[PDB]
Each structure stands twice: as C-alpha cells, then as structure tokens.
Amino acid sequence: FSCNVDGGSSIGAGTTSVYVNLDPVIQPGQNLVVDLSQHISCWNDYGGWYDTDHINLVQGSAFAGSLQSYKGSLYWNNVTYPFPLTTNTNVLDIGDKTPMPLPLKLYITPVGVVIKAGEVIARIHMYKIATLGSGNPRNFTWNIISNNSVVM
Ligand SMILES: CC(=O)N[C@H]1[C@H](Oc2ccccc2-c2cc(C(=O)O)cc([N+](=O)[O-])c2)O[C@H](CO)[C@H](O)[C@@H]1O
Ligand SMILES: CC(=O)N[C@H]1[C@H](Oc2ccccc2-c2cc(C(=O)O)cc([N+](=O)[O-])c2)O[C@H](CO)[C@H](O)[C@@H]1O
After folding, report:
1. Ordered strands of the 2-5 beta sheet
2. Is the CB of 136 under 6 A from ligand 1?
C-alpha cells in the first residue's frame, strides 16, 4: 500500500506535510473548506484488489495547538465526523493500482489572522491494514499546512 502528495514520492508509512490553498479572506460566519482529495492519493501495490487495503482515520486526529479553540467537521469516505476525532472512522477499501484521491475534506470554523501562511492547521492520523497474512499494518500522519494566510 502506498500514497503520494501532489504526485510526489511514494509513502508507505510515517509523517508527511500536505500544503493546501485556502480562501484568503473569509467573513464572520464562514467556514474554511480544505479538500484533501486534491492532494493525497493512495493505491494498492499489487492491483486487481489482490490483498486489499483497509484504511481508516484515527481517534486523536486534531487541530494544531494554536487552533485548539476552532471547531471542525471531517468528511471521510461518505461520512462526516466532528473534529477532533473522538472515534476512529469507517474503513475505505483500496485495491486498484491506479491512485485514488482520498475522499477526505476538513471544514473549519475559526473561533485578524485566521490562519498564518506556513502554520500547521491539523494533524490527521491514518491506519492501514491489508487482507493477507498479518496485513502488514502501517501508520501515517498527514500534517496539513497552509500555503497562504487567511484573514477575517
Ligand atoms: C510488507 C507490505 O507492506 N506489504 C503490502 C504490499 O506492499 C507492497 C507490495 C508490492 C510492492 C511494494 C509494496 C510496498 C510499498 C511501499 C511503498 O511504496 O511505500 C511500502 C511497503 N512497506 O511498507 O513495506 C510495501 O502491498 C499490498 C497491497 O497494497 C499490501 O498493502 C501488503 O500488506
Ligand atoms: C489506536 C489509537 O487510537 N491511538 C494509538 C495510536 O495509533 C495510531 C496513531 C497514528 C496512526 C495510526 C494509529 C493506529 C490506528 C489503529 C486503528 O485505527 O485501528 C491501530 C493501531 N495499532 O494498534 O497499531 C494504530 O498509536 C499510538 C502509539 O504510537 C498510541 O498507541 C495511541 O493509543
């Protein structure tokens, strides 16, 4: 099982930064919408749904400390969860060798500068286990970072 970010090097585990582009000005009452499907894609390394991969997001995924007061919802694989995650999410099965954009979006309610360019916004933890043998479990973290400032 592997992923990449913006079509970069392949990632089988560990921590990767994901740089996103945000609306530079938002009004009070407006949320930020971070569509991570535009950035993170994953695939099965055999193809043909051989040794199918089972992927979920993990309880404890959270805002960066500086944004701890913010409110959020996380969309994953057809279901929406409150954020920070207080449960694991549903499982997405991955079996094609062609990269699948992750069905992942973050909606953020800020509670001046809303987001600073270059600062970590959120940390999303992801778990993989496959089907055959031990399933070769792997842990990933996606550290979401803004490319630009957002003001309100
Ligand atoms: C031991 C293991 O992981 N086995 C998995 C297997 O993995 C590969 C199969 C063929 C070619 C490369 C890999 C592979 C690629 C990467 C990477 O590019 O980052 C990292 C690792 N790794 O972490 O060892 C392995 O894929 C199947 C189907 O996806 C299941 O996921 C299995 O469980
Ligand atoms: C389980 C959990 O919620 N928190 C633990 C956290 O787990 C992860 C952290 C990042 C990415 C994936 C996982 C993970 C998710 C699952 C799953 O979704 O079933 C299963 C496993 N697992 O057993 O290897 C790992 O690991 C830390 C230790 O580094 C502590 O143990 C925490 O308590």
Report:
1. 2-5, 40-43, 100-101
2. yes
